[PDB]
Amino acid sequence: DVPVNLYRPNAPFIGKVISNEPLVKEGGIGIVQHIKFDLTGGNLKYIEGQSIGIIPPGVDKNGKPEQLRLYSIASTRHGDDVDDKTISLCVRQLEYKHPESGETVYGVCSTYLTHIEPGSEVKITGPVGKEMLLPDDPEANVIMLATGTGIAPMRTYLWRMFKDAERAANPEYQFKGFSWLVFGVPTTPNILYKEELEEIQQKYPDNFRLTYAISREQKNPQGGRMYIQDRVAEHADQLWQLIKNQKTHTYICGLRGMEEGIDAALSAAAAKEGVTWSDYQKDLKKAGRWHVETY
Numbered sequence: 001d002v003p004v005n006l007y008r009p010n011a012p013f014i015g016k017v018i019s020n021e022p023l024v025k026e027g028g029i030g031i032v033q034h035i036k037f038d039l040t041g042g043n044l045k046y047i048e049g050q051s052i053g054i055i056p057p058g059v060d061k062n063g064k065p066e067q068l069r070l071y072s073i074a075s076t077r078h079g080d081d082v083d084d085k086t087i088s089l090c091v092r093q094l095e096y097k098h099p100e101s102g103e104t105v106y107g108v109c110s111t112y113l114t115h116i117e118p119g120s121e122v123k124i125t126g127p128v129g130k131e132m133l134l135p136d137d138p139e140a141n142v143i144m145l146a147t148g149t150g151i152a153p154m155r156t157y158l159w160r161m162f163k164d165a166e167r168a169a170n171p172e173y174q175f176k177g178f179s180w181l182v183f184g185v186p187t188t189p190n191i192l193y194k195e196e197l198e199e200i201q202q203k204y205p206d207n208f209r210l211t212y213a214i215s216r217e218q219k220n221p222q223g224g225r226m227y228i229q230d231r232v233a234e235h236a237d238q239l240w241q242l243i244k245n246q247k248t249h250t251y252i253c254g255l256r257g258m259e260e261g262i263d264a265a266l267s268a269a270a271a272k273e274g275v276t277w278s279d280y281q282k283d284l285k286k287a288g289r290w291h292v293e294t295y
């Protein structure tokens with residue numbers, strides 16, 4: 001029932017770009033694009049939490065073909081238009097430093113994707129992943145801990161849960177649990193999907209809580225920049241009490257390195273009741289209730 005590897009690298013699906021929109025507003029850092037592809041003429045199906053691969057054109061420095069890079073699917077199974085014909089990605093352009101040969105290095109696939117024109121054909125493989133799947137239990141609690149483009153799987157959950165057109169398209173899933181997104185970004189113009197996230201929080205104030213950690217605008221208690229681990233420590237007691245519920249699932253997605261500060265906050269909270277978090281967390285992973293995708 002979970003689609004996996006309907007397309008593979010040796011014969012990928014050739015989709016077309018429908019749109020390529022910027023998500024970072026003026027005054028923000030970097031480039032993050034929302035890219036929608038046309039899936040008609042193929043049999044690519046997917047569900048929420050999965051990833052697809054993109055094969056960029058060209059060769060590396062050794063003259064070998066460029067391999068695929070994985071990207072979290074940013075749309076629900078129905079696509080952004082709820083017509084079951086499209087798939088969306090949330091792609092940040094990668095670029096970096098001088099202690100890595102030259103001046104500015106541009107990431108191959110992310111530069112390729114963020115500057116791709118509507119009408120362009122793209123090689124798409126997948127879907128892949130069973131680690132970030134949403135339970136069909138409408139009474140689940142869902143804690144979502146995201147930084148940057150780790151917002152992508154979270155957007156697929158929230159849209160399925162809260163969009164009017166999704167609710168009408170998924171009669172079997174009418175969410176009525178509680179979900180809490182803690183979203184870490186550097187600036188307010190960097191809050192990907194800000195308007196849509198904040199509309200959900202207005203319509204469903206008892207089912208969705210939205211917390212930001214904005215590091216260039218907020219300070220933690222120690223005087224440093226506000227990062228997501230600082231917001232998690234602020235609410236560590238509350239987060240631990242929700243995690244104790246049998247219905248609660250936790251999702252962590254973003255760049256690698258956020259997990260260590262989430263654990264240290266939850267460890268101190270758990271210790272107060274004689275629980276060692278690292279052993280409780282092993283049981284949550286085994287039970288399928290602790291979901292991590294960092295990169």
Ligand SMILES: Cc1cc2nc3c(=O)[nH]c(=O)nc-3n(C[C@H](O)[C@H](O)[C@H](O)COP(=O)(O)OP(=O)(O)OC[C@H]3O[C@@H](n4cnc5c(N)ncnc54)[C@H](O)[C@@H]3O)c2cc1C
Binds near residue numbers: 097108109295
């Ligand atoms: C499951 C999964 C899901 C992902 N989802 C997304 C998503 O939704 N959105 C998204 O934007 N990305 C996502 N990523 C990352 C994405 O796959 C690519 O790694 C990323 O886009 C960069 O690829 P590239 O082709 O642009 O870079 P490459 O051209 O391969 O450049 C990357 C290489 O350069 C180096 N490098 C990178 N950063 C630095 C640095 N700061 N300093 C020094 N060297 C560095 C490393 O050698 C790295 O292997 C995901 C990754 C995985 C594994």
